[PDB]
Design a protein around this ligand. Sequence first.
Ligand SMILES: [Mg+2]
Ligand SMILES: [Mg+2]
Ligand SMILES: [Zn+2]
Lengths: 221, 286, 154, 110, 150, 294, 44, 166
Amino acid sequence: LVIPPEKSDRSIHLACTAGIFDAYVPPEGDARISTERMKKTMASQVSIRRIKDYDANFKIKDFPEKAKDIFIEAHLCLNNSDHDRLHTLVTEHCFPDMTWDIKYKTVRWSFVESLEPSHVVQVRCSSMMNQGNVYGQITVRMHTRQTLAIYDRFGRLMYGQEDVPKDVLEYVVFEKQLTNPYGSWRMHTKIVPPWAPPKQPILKTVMIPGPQLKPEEEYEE
Amino acid sequence: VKKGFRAAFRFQKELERQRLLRCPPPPVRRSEKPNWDYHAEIQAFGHRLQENFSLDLLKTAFVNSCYIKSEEAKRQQLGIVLLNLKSNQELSEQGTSFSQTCLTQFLEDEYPDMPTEGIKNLVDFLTGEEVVCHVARNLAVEQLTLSEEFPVPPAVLQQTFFAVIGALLQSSGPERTALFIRDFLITQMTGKELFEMWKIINPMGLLVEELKKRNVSAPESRLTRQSGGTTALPLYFVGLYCDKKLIAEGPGETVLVAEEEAARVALRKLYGFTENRRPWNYSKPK
Amino acid sequence: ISHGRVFRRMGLGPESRIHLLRNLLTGLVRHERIEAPWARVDEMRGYAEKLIDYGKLGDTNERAMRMADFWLTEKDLIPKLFQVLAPRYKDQTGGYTRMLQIPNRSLDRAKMAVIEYKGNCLPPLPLPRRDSHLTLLNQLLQGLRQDLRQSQEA
Amino acid sequence: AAPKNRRTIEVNRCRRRNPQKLIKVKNNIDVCPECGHLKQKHVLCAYCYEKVCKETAEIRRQIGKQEGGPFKAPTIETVVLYTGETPSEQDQGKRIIERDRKRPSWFTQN
Amino acid sequence: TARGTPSRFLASVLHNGLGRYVQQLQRLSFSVSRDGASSRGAREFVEREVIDFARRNPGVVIYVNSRPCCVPRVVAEYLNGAVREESIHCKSVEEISTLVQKLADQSGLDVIRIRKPFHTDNPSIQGQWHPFTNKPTTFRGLRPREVQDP
Amino acid sequence: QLSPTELTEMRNDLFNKEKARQLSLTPRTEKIEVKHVGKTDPGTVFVMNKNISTPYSCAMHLSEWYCRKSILALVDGQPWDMYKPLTKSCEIKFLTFKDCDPGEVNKAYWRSCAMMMGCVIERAFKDEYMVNLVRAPEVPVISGAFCYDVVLDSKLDEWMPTKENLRSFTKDAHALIYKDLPFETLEVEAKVALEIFQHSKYKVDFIEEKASQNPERIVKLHRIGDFIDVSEGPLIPRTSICFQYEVSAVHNLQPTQPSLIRRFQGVSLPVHLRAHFTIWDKLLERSRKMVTED
Amino acid sequence: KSGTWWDEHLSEENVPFIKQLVSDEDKAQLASKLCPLKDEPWPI
Amino acid sequence: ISRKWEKKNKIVYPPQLPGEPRRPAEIYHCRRQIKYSKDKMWYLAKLIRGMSIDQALAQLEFNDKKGAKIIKEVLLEAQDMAVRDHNVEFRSNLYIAESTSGRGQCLKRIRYHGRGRFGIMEKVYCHYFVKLVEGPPPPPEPPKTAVAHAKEYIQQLRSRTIVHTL
Ligand SMILES: [Mg+2]
Ligand SMILES: [Mg+2]
Ligand SMILES: [Zn+2]
């Protein structure tokens, strides 16, 4: 399935990329705060210009407000499994990650408050005409209180709690197809910092099986 | 593939009956179903019962507090006063009080020998949820009842039934309402045994006290009949004798059971609730 | 009726039975441990025990040499019988072999047994071991034994 | 002799589902202490027996290499010696079959 | 057949007729096509018969619904909750009148085998027979061949 | 003072209250990593819930065989009840009656059989007579019987149980086995235990000795049904483990002048090691002889 | 629920001891009955 | 052909209320087109009904029939699937709620007889269905005791009416 038939004039039309052009590493201890600065900013300004080229009426200041709306509405689709609307709000790279593991699960998610205003940390653009397509990725920082309760196929609480809000610091990356006349801004992926605190523990106990040894084999620590 | 449409259509109808039978749909209020006109249904209700109800009072009797509080919540949810709807609480209290006093008068006149405890238990059975709900459901009260929850809770249905009695009392007066209570609640005693409605314990203890009140000697238990004493299916007839005179006799599978049954038989005779007592007179009052 | 019939009916008849058993015994002498159907191993086990007794007579006993010549189809094993196997059991009067049931054969679900000459150089079979003397039951019986011995000496 | 009438499913179910025809539950299954795999009380553990056979086969292949032909059985006893071991005083005069592995723990040197 | 069908005992709804008689028919729902030929007899019943039938039965709410239909039907509902649907396809006006009157007179209980052609809650006034009813008593209740005062 | 029925209700409430308190200390669902160090299933790691998950829950992750055969747990080299919640990341091994050295399992089974005897003795005598539980002496298994020291009422100072009476105690023990009650454990501070057993002088003295031995003065409490007692060590999971159980003899200990302590004795075997009728009878005879703890 | 037999759980040391113990009791019981007339016989 | 058994693991129940009892997990697994008789397979499926997952695996491991290995293979993947995809905490906490065999699609072949006569031979295939329910295996029914018989007999005596009269 990796490649369609050979020697075909028609090709697959991709609307998204698979990865981040230049991954934004957040400064350590960013959660605590809750020369190089200029160099990164200059790269963002250059990339912003090619974003305003194809779309003249673009405002960086308005995006963090728009990004929050896209984010909240995308996660609300998970609650009612509104996949048709979700494809408009997220890219094809993000859609499998969001929905694959919850196909036979009930997700109750809600947005409570935004602790800190969203800040466009980085703006970057793809190499021109990868295949005739140019993409623009805007990384945004979100510090908000959310509530998540996931239930299993049998309606039994599997993760989280349905009423307790907890703080979430996550840098959501968005992506648009500038060349496409109908392209829009769509949640593309999430940056997970290495220093990010560990997630809350699951409810059930787990067993990690040891090596299954054939008779000839012997167990070595 | 065979030509035609009729056979296919007929089979579709059967496939839909089986589908419904496999998954019976959740029941809904009759008002929600087609062919319903509330005003027409209210008027027919009175006419069936041959009662000249006041349509204003009768409609209020069906309105319950739960339906009013929920109706207001829906209004708030839709961001929509005109809902000054009076509940049936006042009518319910009036009807409940009248029914208890009226039933107490009917039963005191008919059985003058029953103590107040016995008559109270009979009134509690006749006005209890089980009896009242049965009568209400079979008189279309549940269909006309405006409630928050369906099926109507038994307590709500009982309250509505007595509200209708309250409406009748205001509309037609006590005499006409007394006939209604006679014809729909007193009739519920038909076939019932005394101690099937009045649940008592230690009948022998109650019997001894009653005979003391009557200045009669304590009853002596004696074995009148016996069969199969040593078998797994004995028959015993125990007779209760007062001054060596047989007041009652009861059968049983054991002497203890037979003796207890004999005490119940003696109580039924003392209170006038014998199986062969004069039936209740439902004839038009002269 | 088969009262007191001590031999099994296998193979194609009496001669074939001996030949079948002889091939099993020849394999056992060479390899010192073989697996075969349980009934056939049980039948051959008696012959494998007696072969050692003939080996103990020595290679100079002409009767023993004729017996070994018949039963060992591979002649290099006859020196092994007289000079390796029989000397190993010089200090025993019997019990030269051990027979244990193994799981049923995969193809035909035949009941199977492993047989070996004791004292071989091969990896030891997972022999069935009795419960430790330290178990609850064995300790209660040790106490009972101790007590009885003390009462007898008195 | 042919069946004079068809046998009903009611009759057949009685014959087929009779307790005699059913599979009997086994009460002699126990866990093997050495490996933890299930075994029957009177039968050697399959897992342990297979492990022993695998080592036996390896040793037998080594014996073949030393013999190097048919009808070459030795006239002396044999001792299997694993890596890092040398013949003992009691192993003198015995053909030494060397195995290129560490001595198995269950295999005890004698 | 009786063994192949359910049965019930003769009964009434809320002891009907004991204190007063209450008509059990509570609602009638007609579905008469405007143009269907099968509904011709049902249309004539709605023009002259249904109005006079409603005057006589004020406790029955009749719902006449004119809509396209190939099979006109009348649905009868009773106070006990029973629902009965009877087709009036190609029936004459007189036939429909008879059917509608029959529905008015029925209690709504299942039209199935009735075990007994009568019912009573008080079958006995003098005491139900038992094996000792007609037996004489004996002095000191002595049993057959029983030695007293031994 | 409190009636016998009320005394149990008081002690159970205190026991339950302390159990609830320790459960609250647990923060949400913290996770511990328990590594399996047994010979079989080597290398299995259990990610369990601190202060809730017990060794039995780890056996349930493996197979039913572990649950049925595992009588005691070895947690970081220390014997651990199967139903005692695990408190830290540790190594775990499972012990059976048929291990090469089942000494610890024998002691655990041995101590539990004595605790079941205490339960029946306390609930056997008529309410008239007073039964005062003293202690369960730690006697080696080779002694042939487990023993439990009791003090009876002064009225029963010349009474010795009859054979039918001894059989009555046995029938009560077998009823406890039939009930299949778990051995619930609680490690509480001396103060909590002293409140539970305030009415009994012997338990207070016994409780004090155990607290003194340990620096943190935590005492081990066990409960089966409505009977609570103080123990010397880990117990078996359930009473259904016992198959052969008989109260064999009651001896009067000497000196009798201060108080007449009656040593009740019994012998039992688990389902895993049940003995033949003939062999069992021989064990009953030796069990009836007096044992002198050394 | 698994079946057991008398020496299933007995150790190597205890099997000979148990055999000797039960064997001696059988012999002693048989020897104790060799004098019926000295042990309260029934009327002859 | 029908394949409804595979669609029963796709039913999502709604979230349970706080006071409702925890619903047991149900895992449906099957193997299709096994070269083996359904009649012979029925006996093995019958054996393990009501058994715990571990007891069923033990009984099948030491059975001599070919179907035993196939069922054991299916049971093991069902047990793995129960923990991996169905939020079953303990893999041992499973029991056989349902186990049955079905007829598969079979093939017809000729079997030759003497005198030029023939028969039609069916190459038989079957299906195996299993349902695993989370929890301890349900206890067996106690044999109806004498007390129960006497109580039932007396109950029938007491329900006995005078027939064909008032
Ligand atoms: Mg043959
Ligand atoms: Mg031919
Ligand atoms: Zn093994």
